[PDB]
Design a protein around this ligand. Structure first.
Ligand SMILES: Cc1cc(-c2cc(C#N)ccc2O[C@@H]2C[C@@H]2c2ccc(F)cc2F)n[nH]1
Length: 287
């Protein structure tokens, strides 16, 4: 079973789509080890996450749980789950298609060159902050807030960013070299403690990813170097051209004591105040 928002659910509640109704159009990218495709359902445009047939039994239940988790969110900044095709092999999860791709790539592919403005970055930040607030309000801890796990509806104007992957929260419902150490607060990678204030810290790092335009956090540092850097009180410098009000949100997210970090209602509040400052949204992005 899986529980969320006071309700417990099982596989039966997922809407099973007859395999005959599903057509694969494109490969779209890889994952930890599974694949994602562009797909049709008779005609609806979907993304299809596939479970390799060459997989263990823990994998089986991992894949099922992810479907249950995503199915019980009802929020515009969290990708929708359209159904499943689990009674045929390979097993499918049908998901909202995000034509903008992942946020990390979009930021790198869109880095102004010989297009974007500060306000577009704030809306992406606001979008993800809105979803995180919905998760916190419902007592869901994502554990892996990061640009690679966010998607965009479209690359152009009017894009909406949404949280698009929940593999981490499913794993705790693989190893040290696989932990997202660069997105985790001290109490997390030191004690294994996880709360909504853990996602708060991660969002601050995501915020740095957004306003660096897709850079890797702690650019020249390794995982262990970041662990010693952060535990000692070290923090990243502002991204190039980052407005103070935006950097000041990152630093509040990175408070050493979780209970000096803001919740996601306050982060939204402060992001919205940033969209209201001309001196912020008129700041030029670096080329
Ligand atoms: C669920 C879903 C994926 C997509 C999707 C669309 C396009 C288009 N054009 C290109 C890539 C897409 O995902 C690729 C696998 C990587 C990914 C990143 C972050 C995530 F959070 C989840 C992901 F799968 N649309 N919907």
């Amino acid at each position: 079973n899986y529980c969320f928002a006071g309700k417990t659910s099982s596989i039966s509640d997922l809407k099973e789509v007859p395999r005959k109704n599903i057509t694969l159009i494109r490969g779209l990218g890889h994952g930890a080890f599974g694949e994602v495709y562009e797909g049709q359902v008779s005609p609806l445009q979907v993304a299809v996450k596939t479970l390799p047939e060459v997989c263990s039994e823990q994998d089986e239940l991992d894949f099922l749980m992810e479907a249950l988790i995503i199915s019980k969110f009802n929020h515009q900044n969290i990708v929708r789950c359209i159904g499943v095709s689990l009674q045929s092999l390979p097993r499918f999860i049908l998901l909202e298609l995000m034509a903008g791709g992942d946020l990390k790539s979009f930021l790198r592919e869109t880095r102004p060159r010989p297009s974007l403005a500060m306000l577009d970055l704030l809306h992406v930040a606001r979008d993800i902050a809105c979803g995180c607030q919905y998760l916190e309000e419902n007592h869901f801890i994502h554990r892996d807030i990061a640009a690679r796990n966010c998607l965009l509806t479209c690359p152009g104007p009017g894009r909406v960013a949404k949280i698009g992957d929940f593999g981490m929260a499913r794993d705790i419902y693989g190893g040290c070299a696989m932990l997202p150490v660069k997105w985790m607060p001290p109490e997390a990678f030191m004690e294994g403690i996880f709360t909504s204030k853990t996602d708060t810290w991660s969002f601050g790092v995501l915020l740095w990813e957004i306003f660096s335009l897709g850079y890797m956090p702690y650019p020249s540092k390794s995982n262990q170097e970041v662990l010693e850097f952060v535990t000692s009180g070290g923090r990243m410098d502002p991204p190039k051209n980052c407005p103070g009000p935006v950097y000041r949100i990152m630093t509040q997210c990175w408070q050493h004591q979780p209970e000096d970090r803001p919740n996601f209602a306050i982060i939204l509040e402060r992001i919205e105040y940033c969209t209201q400052d001309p001196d912020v949204i008129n700041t030029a992005l670096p080329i």
